[PDB]
Structure formats: C-alpha cells, structure tokens
Amino acid sequence: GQWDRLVLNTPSFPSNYWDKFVKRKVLDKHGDIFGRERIAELLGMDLAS
Amino acid sequence: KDMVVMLLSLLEGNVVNGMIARQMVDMLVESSSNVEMILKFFDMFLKLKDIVGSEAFQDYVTDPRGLISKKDFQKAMDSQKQFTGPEIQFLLSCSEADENEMINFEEFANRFQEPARDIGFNVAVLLTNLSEHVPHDPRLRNFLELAESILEYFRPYLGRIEIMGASRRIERIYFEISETNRAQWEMPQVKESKRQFIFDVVNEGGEAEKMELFVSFCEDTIFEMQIAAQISEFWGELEVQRVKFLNYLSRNFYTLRFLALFLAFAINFILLFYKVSDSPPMVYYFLEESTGYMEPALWCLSLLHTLVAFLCIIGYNCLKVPLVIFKREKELARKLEFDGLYITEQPGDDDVKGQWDRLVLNTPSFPSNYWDKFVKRKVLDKHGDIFGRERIAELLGMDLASLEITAHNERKPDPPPGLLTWLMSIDVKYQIWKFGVIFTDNSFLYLGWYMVMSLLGHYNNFFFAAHLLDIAMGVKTLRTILSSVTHNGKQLVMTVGLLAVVVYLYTVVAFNFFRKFYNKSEDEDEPDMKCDDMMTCYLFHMYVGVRAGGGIGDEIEDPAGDEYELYRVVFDITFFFFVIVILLAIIQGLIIDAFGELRDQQEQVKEDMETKCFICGIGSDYFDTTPHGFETHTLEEHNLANYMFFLMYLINKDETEHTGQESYVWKMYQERCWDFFPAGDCFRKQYEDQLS
Amino acid sequence: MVMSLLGHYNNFFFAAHLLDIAMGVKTLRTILSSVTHNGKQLVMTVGLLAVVVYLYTVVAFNFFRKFYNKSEDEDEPDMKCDDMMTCYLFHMYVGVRAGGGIGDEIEDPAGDEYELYRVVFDITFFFFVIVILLAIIQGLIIDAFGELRDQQEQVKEDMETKCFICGIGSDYFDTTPHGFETHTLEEHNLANYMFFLMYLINKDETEHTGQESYVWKMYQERCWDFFPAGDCFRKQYEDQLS
Numbered sequence: 001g002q003w004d005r006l007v008l009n010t011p012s013f014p015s016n017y018w019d020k021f022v023k024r025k026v027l028d029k030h031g032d033i034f035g036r037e038r039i040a041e042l043l044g045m046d047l048a049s
Numbered sequence: 050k051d052m053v054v055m056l057l058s059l060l061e062g063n064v065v066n067g068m069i070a071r072q073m074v075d076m077l078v079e080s081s082s083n084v085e086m087i088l089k090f091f092d093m094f095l096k097l098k099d100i101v102g103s104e105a106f107q108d109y110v111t112d113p114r115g116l117i118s119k120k121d122f123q124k125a126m127d128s129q130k131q132f133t134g135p136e137i138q139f140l141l142s143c144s145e146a147d148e149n150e151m152i153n154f155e156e157f158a159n160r161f162q163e164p165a166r167d168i169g170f171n172v173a174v175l176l177t178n179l180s181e182h183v184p185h186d187p188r189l190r191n192f193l194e195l196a197e198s199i200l201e202y203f204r205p206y207l208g209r210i211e212i213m214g215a216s217r218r219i220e221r222i223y224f225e226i227s228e229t230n231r232a233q234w235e236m237p238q239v240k241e242s243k244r245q246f247i248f249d250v251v252n253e254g255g256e257a258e259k260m261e262l263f264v265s266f267c268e269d270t271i272f273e274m275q276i277a278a279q280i281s282e283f284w285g286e287l288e289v290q291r292v293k294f295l296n297y298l299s300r301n302f303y304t305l306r307f308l309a310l311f312l313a314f315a316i317n318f319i320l321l322f323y324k325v326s327d328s329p330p331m332v333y334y335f336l337e338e339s340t341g342y343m344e345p346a347l348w349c350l351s352l353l354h355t356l357v358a359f360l361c362i363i364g365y366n367c368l369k370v371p372l373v374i375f376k377r378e379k380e381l382a383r384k385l386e387f388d389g390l391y392i393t394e395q396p397g398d399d400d401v402k403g404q405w406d407r408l409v410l411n412t413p414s415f416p417s418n419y420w421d422k423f424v425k426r427k428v429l430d431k432h433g434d435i436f437g438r439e440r441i442a443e444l445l446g447m448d449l450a451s452l453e454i455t456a457h458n459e460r461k462p463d464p465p466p467g468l469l470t471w472l473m474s475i476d477v478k479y480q481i482w483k484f485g486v487i488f489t490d491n492s493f494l495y496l497g498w499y500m501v502m503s504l505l506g507h508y509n510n511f512f513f514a515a516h517l518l519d520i521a522m523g524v525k526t527l528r529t530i531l532s533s534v535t536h537n538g539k540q541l542v543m544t545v546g547l548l549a550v551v552v553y554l555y556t557v558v559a560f561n562f563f564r565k566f567y568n569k570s571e572d573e574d575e576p577d578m579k580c581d582d583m584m585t586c587y588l589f590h591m592y593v594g595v596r597a598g599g600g601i602g603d604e605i606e607d608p609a610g611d612e613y614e615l616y617r618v619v620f621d622i623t624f625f626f627f628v629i630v631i632l633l634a635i636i637q638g639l640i641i642d643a644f645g646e647l648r649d650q651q652e653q654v655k656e657d658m659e660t661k662c663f664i665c666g667i668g669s670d671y672f673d674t675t676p677h678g679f680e681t682h683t684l685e686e687h688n689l690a691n692y693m694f695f696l697m698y699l700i701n702k703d704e705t706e707h708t709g710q711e712s713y714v715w716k717m718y719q720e721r722c723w724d725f726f727p728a729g730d731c732f733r734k735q736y737e738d739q740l741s
Numbered sequence: 742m743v744m745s746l747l748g749h750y751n752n753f754f755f756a757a758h759l760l761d762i763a764m765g766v767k768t769l770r771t772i773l774s775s776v777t778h779n780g781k782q783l784v785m786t787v788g789l790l791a792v793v794v795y796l797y798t799v800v801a802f803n804f805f806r807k808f809y810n811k812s813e814d815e816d817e818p819d820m821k822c823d824d825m826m827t828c829y830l831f832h833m834y835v836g837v838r839a840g841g842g843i844g845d846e847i848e849d850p851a852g853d854e855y856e857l858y859r860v861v862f863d864i865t866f867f868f869f870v871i872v873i874l875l876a877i878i879q880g881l882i883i884d885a886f887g888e889l890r891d892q893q894e895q896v897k898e899d900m901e902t903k904c905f906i907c908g909i910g911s912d913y914f915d916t917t918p919h920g921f922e923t924h925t926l927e928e929h930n931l932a933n934y935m936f937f938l939m940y941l942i943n944k945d946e947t948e949h950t951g952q953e954s955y956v957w958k959m960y961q962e963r964c965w966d967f968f969p970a971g972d973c974f975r976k977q978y979e980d981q982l983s
C-alpha cells in the first residue's frame with residue numbers, strides 16, 4: 001500500500017486497466033465526505049480542466 | 050422505549066405471517082407520517098455525528114475555540130450533499146447557539162447521543178422482527194429503507210439467536226450485544242481459546258454441555274482480563290502499587306516469557322566462549338575473548354534472567370491459575386450437586402483428584418472463584434432429606450443456625466485494619482488445597498522447573514543450557530513437530546523395549562556358541578573377551594551392534610574359514626534385518642504416521658466446520674439452496690458467538706426484566722437442561738412453506 | 742542474467758545456470774514443491790537439531806572430555822573438546838554425520854569409571870539425533886508428497902461432483918441420462934460466462950437487451966447475484982419441464 005501511494009498522484013495511473021475514469025469516480029463518491037479539493041490533490045487531477 | 054418493548058412483547062411467539070405482526074404492519078402504515086418523523090430524527094443525528102467527525106467539517110471550522118458560526122455550519126451542511134434544506138434549518142434551530150451565533154459542534158453532536166440509543170435499538174429490533182416474520186410485504190420495507198441508517202448503526206450490537214421455545218417451535222430472539230462484550234470477545238486470547246475449543250469438541254465430546262462450559266469459562270476469562278487491564282485504564286498505598294505491579298505482569302506475561310527466551314540465547318551465546326586449562330587465568334574454566342566484559346555481561350544476564358523467571362511465575366499465578374481453580378471448583382460443585390460424588394457415591398479410591406478435593410469441602414471459602422456462592426446451600430436442600438441435614442452440614446462445614454440467621458437481618462462489623470488480620474484470616478485448608486492444585490498443574494510445574502534451573506545456573510552457569518529447551522514450548526512449529534513424537538510416544542517406548550528383548554536373545558545365542566568371535570583386542574598378550582560375561586556381552590550388543598550400520602557382523606571378527614561360518618552368516622544377516630532394518634523402520638514409521646494423523650485431524654475438524662452448522666447439526670447442502678444461505682445461517686442465525694453474548698446478556702439483565710423467552714432460557718440454564726439449543730432444526734425449516 | 746554476465750569473469754558461474762532445470766520442467770517443480778511445502782518445519786527441525794547437539798556439547802565439555810583426543814601420536818594431542826566452540830563444531834560436524842553417532846568418533850569408554858554414563862550418552866545421542874530427528878525431516882518430506890497428491894485429487898473430485906457455478910451436486914443432474922455433462926458444458930459452462938462478458942463489452946450499450954443490460958449494470962456496480970447459486974433451470978421449472 002505504501003509503495004502504491006506514489007502512483008496515485010500521477011496523471012497516467014490507469015495505464016493498463018480498463019477504467020480510465022477511476023479517479024473521476026473516486027471523486028464523485030468520496031468528495032462530499034472528504035472534500036473535493038483534497039481528493040483532487042490526492043489523485044493529482046485538476047477540477048477545472 | 051417502553052411502548053416498543055410492549056409492541057415487541059405482543060409479537061412474541063408469533064409465527065411467520067401471523068395475525069399480530071400483520072396488524073402492527075397495518076399500524077405502521079396508518080402511522081406513516083409519525084414513524085417517518087421518528088426514523089428521520091434518528092437518521093439526522095446519527096449522520097450528524099459522522100459529519101462532525103468528517104475532515105471537510107474540520108477544514109470548514111475557523112475559530113480555535115472549537116466553535117463554528119451558524120452560517121459556516123450551514124454551508125458545511127450544504128457542501129456535504131447529505132441533508133436537505135429544511136432539515137439543515139432544523140439542525141440550526143436545535144443548535145445551542147450563543148448570541149454571537151457560535152455553535153459547539155461536539156456538544157451539539159453528542160447531546161442526543163446517549164438518550165436515543167436504547168430507543169433506537171428497540172426500533173431496530175421491532176423493524177427487524179416484523180421484517181423476518183412478515184417477509185413478503187410491500188409496505189414495511191419502505192420503513193426499512195428509511196431506517197437503513199439506524200439498522201446499520203445498531204447492526205453490530207443487535208444479536209439474534211434461535212431457540213426451541215416451549216411451544217415446540219423454533220423462535221428467534223433479538224437482544225443487545227454491548228460494545229465492551231463484543232470488543233472483549235474479539236480479543237486475540239479469546240479467539241485462540243475459541244479455536245482450541247472447536248478443535249477439542251469436533252475431535253470428540255458432548256456438544257451442548259461442552260459449549261456451555263466453554264461459555265462460562267470464557268466469561269471468567271473476560272473478568273480476569275478486564276481486572277488485569279483495569280490499572281492501564283503505610284500499607285494502603287503499597288497495596289495499591291502492588292496491585293498495579295501484579296496487573297502489569299499479568300497483562301504482558303507473554304512478553305516476559307519471550308524476553309526470558311531471548312536471555313537464554315544471549316547467555317548460551319556467551320557460554321560458547323569457554324576454555325578449560327590447567328593454568329589459572331584441578332583445572333579452571335574461564336572465558337576467552339578480546340573485549341574483557343564478556344564476563345560482567347554474563348553476570349548481569351544471569352541475575353536478569355533469574356528475575357524474569359520469577360516474574361513469569363508471578364504472572365502465571367495472577368493470569369492463568371484463577372481459571373484452573375475455577376475449572377476445578379466448577380466441576381466439583383456439579384459433581385457434588387447433580388451427582389452427589391461425596392454425598393451418595395464416594396471417590397473411586399484410585400482417583401487422586403476426588404480424594405484431594407475432599408479437603409476443600411469443609412472450608413468456609415469453597416466457592417471462591419466460581420459464580421455460585423450458594424452451592425453448599427443447594428446441596429443441603431437437595432440431599433439433606435436422604436442423608437441427614439446435620440451430616441451434610443458437617444461435610445460442607447456450614448452451620449445450620451447461622452444459615453437462617455443470615456436470612457434474617459444480619460449485622461457485621463468491619464474488621465480492624467491490620468496486617469495481622471490478613472495473616473490470621475487465611476483459611477489454611479483451602480489454601481493448601483489451592484496450592485496442591487497449582488503444583489499439580491503442568492504449566493506451573495514447567496515454570497517452576499524453569500526457575501529452579503535458573504537458580505542452579507548460579508551454582509554453575511552451564512545449567513542455563515537447559516533453558517534452551519524452552520524454545521520447544523515457545524514457538525508453535527516446534528510444538529507441532531514434537532507433538533508428532535509425543536503422539537505415538539507409547540508405541541515408541543514399547544518399540545525400544547522390544548529392541549532390548551530381541552538384542553538380549555541375540556546376546557543369549559552369542560554367549561553360548563559364537564564367543565570366540567568377540568575378541569576386541571589387537572595384541573595377543575591382552576585379550577579383551579567381550580562376551581565372557583553376559584552383562585558385558587549384552588552391553589556390547591546393545592551399544593555397538595545396534596549403532597553399527599551393517600549390524601553386529603561389522604564389529605565382531607570374521608567368520609571365514611570356521612566350522613560355524615554358515616551359522617555366523619545367518620546370525621549376522623538376521624540381526625541386520627530384524628534390528629537395523631525392520632525395527633528402526635518401525636520407529637520412523639510411527640513418526641511418519643504421527644505426522645499424517647495430526648494433519649488428518651486438522652483437516653478433519655476444519656472440513657466439519659465448513660460442512661455443518663455447529664449448533665443446528667444440519668449440513669451446508671440444505672442451507673445453500675438459497676444464495677450464500679449457509680454463511681448467513683452461520684453468522685446471522687446460529688452463531689456460536691451470539692449464544693455466548695446471550696448468556697452475558699441474561700446474567701447482566703435484571704430478573705424482573707427478563708422477557709418471556711429470556712426467562713425460559715434462564716430457568717433452563719440454571720437447571721442445566723440444554724433443550725433450548727436448536728438441534729436438527731432451524732427457522733428456515735420450521736417455516737419453510739410460509740417463508741418459501 | 743547476472744550469473745550469465747559473471748560467467749565471463751569466470752566461466753564456472755555458468756554452472757549456476759543449471760539450476761534453471763528446476764524451474765524449467767514440470768516434474769522437478771512438483772518434486773521440489775514437496776520440500777518447499779514444509780520448508781518452515783524443515784528449518785525449525787534443523788534448528789532443533791542444533792539446540793540438542795549443543796546440549797550434548799555442554800555435557801561432553803563438562804564431564805567426558807578425556808574421550809575427545811583425535812590424535813594418534815602422544816607427542817601431539819588434539820583435544821577436540823578443550824573449547825566449547827571447537828567441541829560444538831566437532832559434534833555438529835562429525836557426530837551428526839556419523840552413522841552410529843558421536844560414539845563412533847570419540848575414543849572407547851571400556852574400562853573407565855564413566856563407562857556406563859558414556860554408554861547412555863552415546864546411545865541417547867544415536868536415538869535422539871540420528872534416528873528420530875532425521876526421521877522427522879524425512880517424514881516432513883513424505884507427508885508433503887501425500888498432501889500435494891491429496892490436494893490434486895481433492896480439487897479434481899470436486900470438479901466432477903459439483904457444478905462450478907450452481908454448486909449443485911452431480912447426483913441431482915444425473916437423474917436424467919448424462920444430465921450432469923449437459924448441465925456442465927451446455928447450461929452452466931464457465932467458458933460461456935466469460936464469452937458473455939466479452940460479448941457485453943463489445944456490444945453497444947444502446948443495443949443491449951433487457952437481460953444483457955441487467956447483467957451489465959450489475960457487473961459495473963460489482964454485484965454477483967445474477968450468477969445462479971443453488972438453483973438451475975431444471976430446478977426452477979422441474980414440474981413443467983418434467
């Protein structure tokens with residue numbers, strides 16, 4: 001788990017897996033509870049773009 | 050809560066799709082608005098506590114005083130996407146805001162936190178009971194959907210068990226499992242004890258009674274560990290510090306047993322650097338090293354190891370010994386009450402346990418650890434008519450007059466505070482019995498040996514080598530591997546005895562005929578006749594003949610060119626086959642099949658656990674006609690953990706407040722009849738047609 | 742690769758490359774899986790051997806030390822148990838390897854006032870190390886073979902007594918002639934449940950039929966209730982299908 005922490009921030013996380021929109025589902029699930037901006041920083045994604 | 054405990058009562062005894070359950074479902078439909086208000090009140094505050102814990106809330110707060118403005122609180126409630134507008138306004142209204150409009154979010158989170166817990170649990174029980182007894186109803190599951198949050202929160206604490214009620218039908222009982230009980234049941238020690246009990250009961254035993262003795266023991270272990278962890282949660286102050294010290298030892302007893310082993314390795318590693326030389330640094334043993342303080346290190350480690358061993362003995366006296374004395378007091382009081390082992394019958398005159406336990410009966414403090422403190426007064430009321438009340442009084446040491454005096458008003462004075470009172474109030478008889486039990490215990494004897502070797506280590510440090518064997522009892526794997534040998538120990542010892550007999554037969558033959566062949570001497574001046582005496586010749590065979598790979602033929606001289614040559618060939622060859630080959634093969638085979646049997650036993654029990662329910666006895670085949678039905682029936686319907694939490698619920702609950710089914714179970718526990726356990730039946734079976 | 746490169750520094754490193762055969766062919770992988778199955782117990786057994794031999798080294802160092810003279814000429818004595826380091830190495834090396842035990846190596850106890858104790862010492866060394874402990878090691882290997890064989894028969898017989906998906910046994914499905922085989926590779930075939938997914942994934946969402954859409958929505962939300970557990974088309978319509 002601690003090693004896998006590195007790859008979350010990267011923009012090319014789901015490189016081989018089918019879902020290329022996993023980050024945008026983690027946001028839509030946990031953003032309310034833990035802050036959309038915080039999830040954006042953890043997943044490296046930018047909200048505006 | 051009282052209203053719902055009544056509604057629940059009416060539903061008692063009610064079959065699936067019964068009249069009363071359907072009537073209350075019609076009720077709740079008719080009171081839909083009000084019921085929804087109640088459920089959504091509980092939902093509001095149960096969600097509210099979680100939001101108060103959420104990170105978004107704590108980065109919306111600004112004041113270091115831990116207070117949030119009403120507007121800030123409001124926009125926090127909006128951003129959590131969780132409540133609607135009007136209920137956000139309601140929460141703001143409930144906010145104990147000051148004139149500055151600043152809310153203490155912890156206090157507002159927790160004001161309704163405790164008062165609503167019991168009523169919430171009762172509502173959860175009511176909804177679950179109606180759902181399970183009226184399964185096919187469009188109208189109730191609406192309420193269940195609204196109350197999903199309450200059911201989720203009170204799920205961990207809502208235990209259900211099925212029993213066989215008086216009406217000869219399986220009935221489900223819903224009760225409350227407290228937080229402490231659940232936390233204590235999941236603790237590692239209790240879980241290990243659980244798996245041992247399962248292993249023992251599945252290898253052999255009467256199930257229901259053994260479970261109940263497993264529950265009762267566990268309930269006493271729970272007491273002891275809460276007592277031990279209590280501290281972590283003039284003579285008076287020293288007594289307080291003494292209790293703290295002994296509880297600290299008991300709490301981390303295993304760490305002490307682990308450090309003791311570490312010290313044994315450390316010392317024995319120090320012990321490797323010895324040298325024996327005539328010249329002082331008779332003959333003198335001394336360490337050889339370049340450092341210089343190998344030796345003071347050894348001296349400190351010897352004392353520290355001895356101290357740790359003594360501390361472990363104290364830890365054992367305060368952690369595990371009370372359970373042992375409980376399991377003997379418990380069994381004796383049953384043998385005394387239900388079987389009359391000393392009233393009617395008498396100990397079998399070959400069992401040391403009964404005759405030893407005879408001492409403690411006369412003592413006034415017999416049930417010191419067991420729950421029943423009135424066992425003597427029940428043995429009297431049962432057997433006094435048959436065998437004389439006075440005789441039972443003498444056997445149990447109780448006095449008849451003061452027995453009824455305590456039934457009247459009874460005044461007692463507090464004894465003067467003095468160590469002499471402690472010293473003299475000791476019941477020498479009960480203590481003698483207790484220590485006889487303790488020194489009879491295997492683990493205590495092992496720890497005592499460990500201490501004795503540690504002390505003798507100061508007479509000569511090499512005794513610390515014995516302390517290495519602790520590893521066998523330390524780690525699991527060597528305990529399994531050595532359990533292989535100890536499984537067939539009896540056959541191994543008898544095989545070794547058979548070897549001695551056979552070798553003695555060969556010694557007989559060698560002594561009578563082939564004696565010129567046993568000259569283990571090189572020079573002709575000195576002959577070394579090894580079979581001149583049968584003592585020497587038997588020792589010769591038993592020592593070198595068995596150990597030699599070829600057999601006795603390798604050691605003794607050659608038979609070539611002798612008139613007994615052919616007989617010697619037969620003798621040596623049959624020695625090789627019947628001792629070196631077959632008998633050693635038998636010994637090794639006992640070991641191999643011991644491994645096989647132990648592996649078989651573990652797979653044996655384990656596969657039992659996943660093919661049948663522990664309580665029901667019904668197989669997984671029936672319960673899997675529904676998707677994953679067996680798992681649900683395992684840890685929802687008939688869960689052995691829940692049947693323990695029942696007992697701790699009953700014992701705690703006040704007798705006046707026991708419900709009908711609970712009272713029925715309790716009266717049976719006390720009289721020790723186990724018909725309430727569902728055997729060969731289940732709620733699915735009882736109502737198979739209606740539940741469909 | 743690293744051994745192959747070091748093979749140019751000294752060609753003998755290519756010898757390590759032979760161990761590849763263990764990972765190459767199936768049979769040696771099974772045979773070595775025997776040892777690796779009970780590797781933990783084997784290592785602990787070897788450790789126990791060291792502890793026991795150390796105990797014997799303690800006893801030998803204290804009492805039976807005159808018997809450890811591995812020297813022929815009287816001018817040069819070769820005291821092997823003068824130091825505990827040397828004496829432990831002596832036992833651990835030659836005592837364990839000797840067939841008889843430590844009694845074969847050390848000198849004879851005949852005609853000595855510790856003779857009887859030496860007899861007990863050597864004999865119990867033979868039983869508790871050469872016989873029992875080596876038997877334990879070999880027994881771990883044998884039962885490893887037995888367990889692996891049992892596991893393969895275990896799974897295999899499962900596969901031919903119950904359907905993988907349904908969970909129902911072959912007894913029900915064989916009330917009809919060869920019914921179990923049909924229910925295996927016609928009705929509930931695990932290969933077909935994979936070809937479904939590759940059918941759904943490929944198919945255009947607009948064109949998913951009702952049942953296909955229902956399955957797809959469940960795959961995506963990751964609920965597995967659509968798999969038939971404990972039921973089959975034969976069971977559902979047993980009366981009508983007859």
Ligand SMILES: Nc1ncnc2c1ncn2[C@@H]1O[C@H](COP(=O)(O)OP(=O)(O)OP(=O)(O)O)[C@@H](O)[C@H]1O
Nearest residue numbers: 240658659660661662663664683684687688689690
């Ligand atoms: N009445 C029963 N109560 C509990 N378990 C049962 C019962 N009947 C059968 N079982 C079997 O017991 C198994 C679980 O036992 P176990 O003690 O491992 O549960 P656990 O909570 O997972 O324990 P651990 O966490 O130690 O593994 C289940 O697989 C189930 O098949």
Ligand SMILES: Nc1ncnc2c1ncn2[C@@H]1O[C@H](COP(=O)(O)OP(=O)(O)OP(=O)(O)O)[C@@H](O)[C@H]1O
Nearest residue numbers: 900901902903904905906907925926929930931932
């Ligand atoms: N749902 C299922 N799907 C597939 N096979 C099943 C199922 N349930 C049970 N089986 C068992 O699986 C066995 C076939 O497995 P296997 O993979 O060998 O099939 P196969 O196509 O012959 O494979 P191979 O060609 O490698 O032997 C059958 O004998 C059958 O009893």
Ligand SMILES: Cn1c(=O)c2c(ncn2C)n(C)c1=O
Nearest residue numbers: 264265268420696700718719
């Ligand atoms: C107090 N008490 C009881 O009264 C009891 C019991 N088990 C059965 N009964 C009746 N246990 C474990 C118990 O602690």
Ligand SMILES: [Zn+2]
Nearest residue numbers: 662664665687
């Ligand atoms: Zn059950």
Ligand SMILES: [Zn+2]
Nearest residue numbers: 904906907929
């Ligand atoms: Zn199938």
